[PDB]
């Protein structure tokens with residue numbers, strides 16, 4: 019059972035919820051967490067979805083080794099096998115760019131060779147984490163990373179936006195998490211690329227923005243450095259236009275924070291490992307096949323409508339124990355079946371998100387459960403989307419910044435997009451924060467969806483002519 | 495390009511050519527690690543889908559455990575990669591990279607299991623693993639490799655053993671039904687079995703061109719040994735505490751290598767239809783603007799018609815390559831069926847289809863295309879299998895005395911011989927056989943076949959002369 023309340027003490031809530039939900043398990047090496055099936059199934063579902071969509075695009079999967087040689091630094095060295103030292107120390111690769119892009123320079127010779135489109139599902143190691151937290155700040159995480167090379171900038175840009183739409187769909191259609199499409203500022207884009215696009219999400223309980231996924235128009239700078247050249251149709255050598263795009267198990271974290279409540283998790287039915295848990299009202303020793311037999315008939319029929327079902331027939335636990343257990347785990351539907359239910363030909367179903375109860379005839383069960391699951395998924399999304407809209411304040415001047423930040427809100431303000439002004443704003447907001455102790459605010463994205471910018475509008479900080487509406491807040 | 499090394503002459507060079515020219519492997523600066531390019535990865539994805547669905551049917555759930563292991567947990571040796579520094583700082587405690595995940599998972603198993611109601615526990619992992627050996631071979635013997643490792647705990651040994659055998663049967667289907675590679679089920683000897691466990695079962699495969707057996711996959715009865723090491727106990731109904739019974743089982747990208755070596759020919763890969771991501775490649779023949787737009791249309795129509803039958807079809811309508819280039823390209827790549835449509839063919843109501851395995855061509859009506867391609871694909875799959883099974887049968891010699899060993903070994907053959915199963919006898923046989931190999935050459939136990947020939951009374955061990963316990967399959971090996 020979850021004791022900490024989600025809005026009073028969020029961090030404690032988060033920890034309690036993900037452990038009592040049987041999502042992760044601890045490990046004797048810091049910053050590392052075992053992903054148990056109740057979370058890994060969610061990864062499996064968003065992975066299958068995204069993989070199907072990028073395969074429609076012509077992206078194909080690959081595997082690159084996890085090691086890199088000396089010809090490459092703050093990196094992890096493997097120096098022995100058994101007790102023997104290696105001839106040359108090898109490193110666990112920092113990035114994938116370093117291994118893939120020489121390979122790309124080999125494989126690309128002519129315009130016939132483009133576009134080249136590769137994706138990799140793997141795990142990533144990061145060595146410097148501050149305070150570890152499952153799915154958010156961890157030593158190892160899972161992701162997918164894709165890397166494309168195209169003959170022209172416009173094709174590459176088109177692909178960047180197509181992938182970004184797939185990330186919108188990952189978060190919104192699968193995990194029911196609303197996100198905002200935008201372009202990163204110069205001070206927050208990938209170091210070597212032309213443009214970074216992003217989907218952003220909001221955590222109301224701490225008012226923090228978090229980056230859901232990135233899609234970079236890398237341009238030619240990497241092709242210049244790595245000598246990825248192709249000869250065009252008229253015989254000249256040209257640099258390829260690259261993109262790269264990535265999404266991680268952080269998405270699981272964003273889903274938890276989005277839909278959980280004081281009772282624990284709420285997993286959207288599209289990714290829940292069990293959509294419907296069947297709980298026999300049995301106490302202690304009451305073993306007759308009457309209840310468990312009807313429970314099995316019901317599981318069979320629900321499964322043939324492609325519903326993911328579990329019967330929790332564990333003898334040594336009370337029905338109320340089981341209710342709380344599966345509520346903390348976040349199953350969207352619970353099917354109570356007891357002697358009175360059996361003696362009426364119905365079942366009682368409870369929704370996890372609202373707690374509403376329904377008495378349903380056994381014949382009606384499969385259609386009504388499909389309907390209720392669609393309703394739960396849409397409800398989760400719509401309420402999160404109203405919360406997101408409610409968390410963004412449209413300001414005009416800098417005096418409105420610190421009020422909004424203290425309402426745990428984001429701000430949308432006209433900005434001149436000058437890079438030094440962003441660092442000044444972060445400095446200023448963090449110092450204002452510090453003195454309020456009696457922290458910093460940064461750009462999240464420049465949204466694709468731009469309100470009108472009246473002629474002559476001034477930037478909310480510098481005073482200079484504002485160019486675009488930018489979204490700011492405190493951030494993960 | 496095209497393969498020019500011949501398979502029955504220089505096998506090493508043939509293999510390298512086949513896997514490079516088909517765009518399956520790219521070579522890499524670090525010995526023993528290789529880049530797996532999409533064309534290989536498609537096959538790996540087919541077999542992973544197969545196996546994942548089947549183990550899901552058994553109630554096994556996927557999970558992800560960390561890739562690093564602590565020194566203590568690992569040592570509760572010579573092949574384990576150690577991270578010892580970050581930058582130039584030595585780490586306070588060195589940590590290992592995963593060579594296998596028993597010591598990563600079983601502390602968690604010990605925490606998660608309390609009553610007989612927690613059992614069976616059935617978890618599986620798709621991931622990569624590092625073991626630092628010998629001389630490397632792409633797919634076959636690599637230092638980092640992709641695999642699945644499954645781990646289960648049960649209340650009884652008989653239930654564990656049942657699962658061991660079911661998973662081994664799944665590996666037989668992986669190789670034989672999916673990759674059209676025959677394999678022999680058996681037990682490892684006591685000296686060849688998984689360290690710490692009770693009984694290791696295995697499927698074994700054979701490479702005729704060098705006479706070498708190879709371990710395709712393994713299914714372990716870990717028994718209760720690890721349960722003691724990690725304190726994995728449960729309360730039964732009587733209330734008594736009992737150690738669980740554990741299985742461990744895994745299989746890797748080595749299967750791809752075996753498939754290649756089994757089915758390839760002097761032209762390159764031959765991919766069995768069941769794991770071919772492209773089963774039929776449609777080549778539109780365009781020359782002198784003859785009916786260029788019309789034929790492309792009929793190609794798209796045929797694609798649609800065939801997809802309605804779940805045939806995996808690709809149209810190579812790339813304008814920047816000639817048709818002859820396209821033929822060579824899709825044959826090195828091993829696509830089982832090639833469908834040529836030119837204006838001659840649009841005139842008739844037919845298409846020309848060539849099988850990759852034999853080269854035989856067929857003129858097929860459009861209305862007949864779906865059923866006849868389904869039939870040819872099932873035929874190609876079966877012929878790949880049957881030809882390789884014949885070669886496996888003729889690669890094994892049944893002997894009775896040690897004098898027959900070195901002749902058989904030099905005919906590039908395996909030996910099935912009556913053995914007493916004494917552990918020292920296996921190391922003795924290894925050393926004797928390598929010494930005589932000279933006059934990497936050693937013969938070891940591949941497996942004790944499940945399918946045992948009859949053992950006449952008084953049959954002597956082929957090496958010690960003591961009574962023979964069972965028939966054993968010996969060979970030179972990978």
Ligand SMILES: Nc1ncnc2c1ncn2[C@@H]1O[C@H](COP(=O)(O)OC(=O)[C@@H]2CCCN2)[C@@H](O)[C@H]1O
Nearest residue numbers: 594634635636643709710711712742743744746748
């Ligand atoms: N260097 C290599 N390259 C490619 N494939 C390889 C290599 N070495 C072995 N294999 C392949 O991987 C498997 C490793 O199994 P196992 O005996 O080490 O057992 C276990 O570890 C148990 C079961 C899983 C969890 N624990 C072998 O069957 C072989 O096909």
Ligand code: PRO
Nearest residue numbers: 163164232262263264
């Ligand atoms: O770190 C990132 O954001 C990029 C995404 C693709 C691979 N690396």
